[PDB]
Enzyme design. Structure first.
Site, mmCIF file in Angstrom:
data_model
loop_
_atom_site.group_PDB
_atom_site.id
_atom_site.type_symbol
_atom_site.label_atom_id
_atom_site.label_comp_id
_atom_site.label_asym_id
_atom_site.label_seq_id
_atom_site.Cartn_x
_atom_site.Cartn_y
_atom_site.Cartn_z
ATOM 1 N N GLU A 9 4.638 -0.318 1.139
ATOM 2 C CA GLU A 9 4.723 -0.440 -0.323
ATOM 3 C C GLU A 9 4.762 -1.883 -0.820
ATOM 4 O O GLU A 9 4.725 -2.132 -2.026
ATOM 5 C CB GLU A 9 5.976 0.264 -0.866
ATOM 6 C CG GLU A 9 6.196 1.700 -0.425
ATOM 7 C CD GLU A 9 7.372 2.326 -1.159
ATOM 8 O OE1 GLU A 9 7.970 1.628 -1.999
ATOM 9 O OE2 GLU A 9 7.698 3.502 -0.909
ATOM 10 N N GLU A 12 0.806 -1.209 0.000
ATOM 11 C CA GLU A 12 0.000 0.000 0.000
ATOM 12 C C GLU A 12 0.845 1.267 0.000
ATOM 13 O O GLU A 12 2.064 1.233 0.147
ATOM 14 C CB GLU A 12 -0.943 0.017 1.215
ATOM 15 C CG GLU A 12 -0.296 -0.400 2.528
ATOM 16 C CD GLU A 12 0.969 0.381 2.837
ATOM 17 O OE1 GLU A 12 0.904 1.615 3.021
ATOM 18 O OE2 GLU A 12 2.043 -0.242 2.887
HETATM 19 O O1 LIG Z 1 4.380 -1.528 6.354
HETATM 20 C C1 LIG Z 1 4.609 -1.104 7.606
HETATM 21 O O2 LIG Z 1 4.782 -1.849 8.541
HETATM 22 C C2 LIG Z 1 4.608 0.429 7.613
HETATM 23 C C3 LIG Z 1 4.856 0.868 8.996
HETATM 24 C C4 LIG Z 1 4.884 2.289 9.135
HETATM 25 C C5 LIG Z 1 4.711 3.234 8.102
HETATM 26 N N1 LIG Z 1 4.474 2.660 6.803
HETATM 27 C C6 LIG Z 1 4.287 3.528 5.570
HETATM 28 O O3 LIG Z 1 4.147 4.866 5.936
HETATM 29 C C7 LIG Z 1 2.807 5.334 5.619
HETATM 30 C C8 LIG Z 1 1.975 5.286 6.852
HETATM 31 O O4 LIG Z 1 2.620 6.071 7.866
HETATM 32 P P1 LIG Z 1 1.817 7.269 8.513
HETATM 33 O O5 LIG Z 1 2.665 7.916 9.555
HETATM 34 O O6 LIG Z 1 1.471 8.351 7.354
HETATM 35 O O7 LIG Z 1 0.559 6.746 9.114
HETATM 36 C C9 LIG Z 1 2.286 4.492 4.479
HETATM 37 O O8 LIG Z 1 2.382 5.125 3.172
HETATM 38 C C10 LIG Z 1 3.109 3.178 4.636
HETATM 39 O O9 LIG Z 1 3.528 2.746 3.310
HETATM 40 C C11 LIG Z 1 4.424 1.310 6.548
HETATM 41 C C1 LIG Z 2 8.832 9.224 0.521
HETATM 42 C C2 LIG Z 2 7.835 8.434 1.311
HETATM 43 C C3 LIG Z 2 7.253 8.995 2.442
HETATM 44 C C4 LIG Z 2 6.348 8.271 3.155
HETATM 45 C C5 LIG Z 2 6.035 7.028 2.769
HETATM 46 C C6 LIG Z 2 5.037 6.246 3.576
HETATM 47 C C7 LIG Z 2 6.628 6.462 1.625
HETATM 48 N N1 LIG Z 2 6.292 5.124 1.182
HETATM 49 C C8 LIG Z 2 7.509 7.166 0.921
#
Ligand SMILES: O=C(O)c1ccc[n+]([C@@H]2O[C@H](COP(=O)([O-])O)[C@@H](O)[C@H]2O)c1
Ligand SMILES: Cc1ccc(C)c(N)c1
Ligand SMILES: O=C(O)c1ccc[n+]([C@@H]2O[C@H](COP(=O)([O-])O)[C@@H](O)[C@H]2O)c1
Ligand SMILES: Cc1ccc(C)c(N)c1
EC number: 2.4.2.21
Lengths: 347, 347
Positions: free
Chosen positions: A315, A172
């Site tokens: 992602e 995602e």
């Molecule tokens: O895949 C995980 O375990 C993961 C853990 C923390 C953050 N992320 C990535 O960061 C984004 C979500 O973080 P946030 O702080 O905007 O809620 C989102 O685009 C995810 O791809 C992803």
């Molecule tokens: C650059 C950037 C910032 C924040 C997220 C969650 C991704 N995947 C990439």
């Protein structure tokens, strides 16, 4: 239609699994010495779409992109436009999943299920709306919107199977999505928000209290029913989370394996298993997310990741990183020699 | 000569590591989001043999094969001839490491450092003797035999570097070798034998007491000095264990990375770090062995494996399985786009 989908998910093939186990026990090694690689090969053998044997053909990582109204509650430090920008970068092969998928020989499918921006050329268009509703004051979407997206993504997923894909990876992209993910985990596991709310994408430790309050408000105001996975997704989830759940239902209906990614994927897997328990045997964990609520989510899915990389990018990067492990279990199964051929006998 | 070797092991290049960190922080992702993959890339950047950047050229897994006199104490259920038979199978590509190395694009080098059988064509011959002494009643070998093998294997290892190899994997093959491995772990960590003696290759739970007694006798009778890694190797180790230690010293002298395998490799790494602490920064863990004493051994090396596969085959199979992870850290470093190029700014 969706009832038909859920009704037609195949059970694992116990006959193929029994033949698989016997073959593995006879390979050139002490029985059970390759541990989880052996159990993985047997699991794969029971998946109908794999033709009674652990094998991997084409590989695809499906990345669901969407924006969230809850971003306005200040639960994320990344600019909201990063969703749209990163989605575009996905089509250029410069992102984390693109580089890791390329390494594993997998293709990345970028799907827009609700980005709050103009359509991005090159991205698969399945957008429900320009971002979902702010879950802090109401539902993310209507039940019908959730059901329609589940169906749409499910069909797309199994349609890829018709083109040679035999292994899927889910991922995602959506700023603020660790908030609805935390809400869903809290609801499904019965854990207090404080225990499952993490720092997401580098949220300052001083702003965590607000994030916890937002998750609690979302639950109190929407009153999602824990026994109805779709009710939870539509009330406190998001388009991206719904889409990931859809990939899992589609692959299971297709009788094919799906590799989970991180924390966001665990919440989507909890929803999918609640909606249809028959989906469980098709799920394969990849890594152990550094997100705070990962341990609780995994315990409830009764899964133990293979990789401990402290990753938290999302992602579908973790899913791509584990694809070589799946191919390794297949290589072990098909390429190792046999004990009997070397005249070796072990008690 | 060996003193020269140990004296010339290079320290990590802090300047290259600083440039590496800065570059990684600027990649298209939240800082630190790729966790252990980032730390791995920086570690690689500091290794002089890699030319200031995380990269992987050719890959090789060196498998040290030898027999042990302690096999006569009934500490292993596998026939002693399996060592010689499996060594031959290694040249045919039918073993577990061969299949996994092939998957990772690595070549397997089979080295006979002391198999109790006639020479096997195709296997690199560096045999010290037909099996080492029974450690239960005396030493495995003389100090000079241990030092000579260390030197010999060290040179062979770094010589491969001259042919393009930039990443090594260590492995072994020898019936009964989890007994001396347990003895070494007990001696180096100061742990009681009962805490580090495992079932090895499916030893019946009823025969574990005998194995524990054998390890204790080996220590009492030989009185190995914990502060002298070579004294320990020659007294309660084996030719295969010595050889693995030699690969680690050779790669470090060569300023190149070495991937550990399972329990046998942890004992050899404890010896290598005792002999020369400068070897530590070149060691990379692969998986978490299912052997009972693995946790204690890893704690003392202060290492946390990437893979949790419950594997316990040996042969360097875990090392080969982790090679894709090393290449992934390199791919991340060289192929990801940069934040600045997308006009993205994160606090
Ligand atoms: O895949 C995980 O375990 C993961 C853990 C923390 C953050 N992320 C990535 O960061 C984004 C979500 O973080 P946030 O702080 O905007 O809620 C989102 O685009 C995810 O791809 C992803
Ligand atoms: C650059 C950037 C910032 C924040 C997220 C969650 C991704 N995947 C990439
Ligand atoms: O690598 C490990 O962690 C490992 C753990 C247990 C057993 N082994 C393998 O099994 C052999 C040692 O087992 P054993 O019972 O003969 O002492 C040896 O040939 C190893 O390759 C290997
Ligand atoms: C067949 C067989 C038996 C025992 C061991 C330790 C290996 N590597 C292989």
């Amino acid at each position: 239609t969706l009832h038909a989908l859920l009704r037609d998910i195949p059970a694992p093939d116990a006959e193929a699994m029994a033949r698989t186990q016997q073959h593995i026990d006879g390979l050139l090694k002490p029985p059970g010495s390759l541990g989880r690689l052996e159990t993985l090969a047997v699991q794969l053998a029971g998946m109908p779409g794999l033709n009674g044997t652990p094998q991997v053909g084409e590989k695809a990582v499906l990345v669901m992109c969407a924006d969230h109204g809850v971003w306005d509650e200040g639960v994320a430090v990344s600019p909201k436009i990063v969703t749209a920008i990163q989605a575009a970068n996905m089509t250029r092969g410069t992102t984390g999943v693109c580089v890791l998928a390329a390494q594993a020989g997998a293709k990345v499918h970028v799907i827009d299920v609700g980005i709050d921006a103009e359509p991005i050329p090159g991205v698969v268009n399945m957008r429900v709306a320009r971002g979902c509703g702010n879950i802090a004051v109401g539902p993310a979407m209507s039940r019908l919107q959730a059901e329609a997206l589940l169906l749409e993504v499910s069909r797309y997923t199994c349609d890829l199977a018709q083109r040679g894909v035999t292994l899927f990876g889910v991922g995602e992209l959506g700023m603020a999505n660790t908030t609805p993910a935390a809400a869903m985990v809290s609801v499904f596991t019965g854990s207090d928000a404080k225990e499952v709310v993490g720092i997401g994408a580098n949220l300052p430790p001083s702003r965590i209290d607000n994030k916890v309050d937002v998750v609690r408000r979302a639950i109190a105001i929407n009153q999602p029913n824990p026994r109805d996975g779709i009710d939870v997704l539509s009330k406190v989830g998001g388009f991206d989370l719904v889409g990931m759940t859809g990939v899992m239902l589609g692959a299971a209906r297709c009788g094919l394996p799906v590799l989970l990614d991180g924390f966001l994927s665990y919440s989507a897997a909890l929803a999918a298993c609640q909606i249809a328990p028959a989906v469980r045997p098709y799920l394969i964990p990849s890594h152990f997310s550094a997100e705070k609520g990962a341990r609780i989510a995994l315990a409830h899915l009764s899964m133990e990741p293979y990789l401990h990389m402290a990753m938290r990018l999302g992602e579908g990067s973790g899913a791509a990183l584990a694809m070589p492990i799946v191919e390794a279990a297949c290589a072990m199964f098909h390429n190792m020699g046999e004990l009997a051929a070397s005249n070796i006998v072990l008690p």
